[PDB]
Amino acid sequence: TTIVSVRRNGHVVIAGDGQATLGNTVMKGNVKKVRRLYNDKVIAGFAGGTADAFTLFELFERKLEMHQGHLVKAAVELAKDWRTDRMLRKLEALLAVADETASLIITGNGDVVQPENDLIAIGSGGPYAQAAARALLENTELSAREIAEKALDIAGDICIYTNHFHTIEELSY
Template identity: 90%
Template sequence: DGQATLGNTVMKGNVRKVRRLYHDRVIAGFAGGTADAFTLFELFERKLELHQGHLVKAAVELAKDWRTDRMLRKLEALLAVADENASLIITGNGDVVQPENDLIAIGSGGPYAQAAARALLENTELGARDIVEKSLGIAGDICIYTNQFHTIEELASKA
C-alpha cells in the first residue's frame, strides 16, 4: 500500500514503498520508518553490487551489519526482497526469512494480505498478479493502517 502514518494520522497516501534494484533483477519493499527504509535500501543495493546480485548473500550480509552496527541497530524498518530465485524478509534482529511458498508480506496489513494470498493460491487458479491485487485490496479493507494505493512490480518468470 502507499499509506504513511504518524501515530494514528495519515500523513500521505501515495508513498512508493517498492523499488527495483540491481539492474531491475531485484524487487525490494519496506515497512516501517521511511527514512530508515531508504537507508536500508541503499545499504542493500551496495551489498547486491558487492555480491554481483546474489540475493541471499546480500541479504545475509545486510542482516549481519544491521544487527551488529550500533547506528544501524536503531533503524526501524523491515525489508522484503525478491529475485527470480527467492523471496526474503530481512529484519534488524539479524533474521533473513524465506517464507513458505515464497509468499511474503510485511507491515501493518501484511498478515491480512498474506492470509488472503495463501487462501487464493491454494483455492483458485488465479495468476500471481491477480492474487497480489486481490490480497492487497482485502488488507486495505481490513487494516486501518493500509490503504488502496498499490504499487505492484513483477519479475520476469523463469518459465
C-alpha cells in the same frame, strides 16, 4: 502498512499500499513502499521509515554488488551489518526483497527469513494479506500479480492502517 510478495510460475511480485499514519490521522496517502534495485534485477518493499529504507536498500544493493548477486548471501551480509553498526542498528524497518531465484524477509534482528511458498506479507496488514493470498493461491489459477493485488486490497479493507493505494513491482523469468 501492508506489503505482499507472491511467486507464481515465471513471475514474482512485491505490492504495498501507500498509507502513512501518525497517531490516528493519515500523514500521507501515497507513500511508495516498493521499488526496484540492482539494475532492476531485484524488487523490494519496506515497512517503515521512508528514509531508513533508502539507507538500507542501498547497502543491500551494495552487497549484491561484490557478491556476484547471490540474493540470499547478500541478504545474510546485509542483516549482519544491520544488526551490528550503531548507525544501522538505529533504524527500524521490515525488509522484503525478491528476485528470479527466491524471495525473503530481512529484519533489524539480523534475521533473514523466507516464508514457505515465497509468500511474504509484512506490516500491520501482513496477516490479512496472507490469509487472502493463500485462499487464492490455494483455490485459484490467478497470476502472481492478481493475487498479491487482490490480497493487498482485501487487507486494505480490513486494516485501519493500510489503504488502497498500490505500488507493484514484478519480475519475469
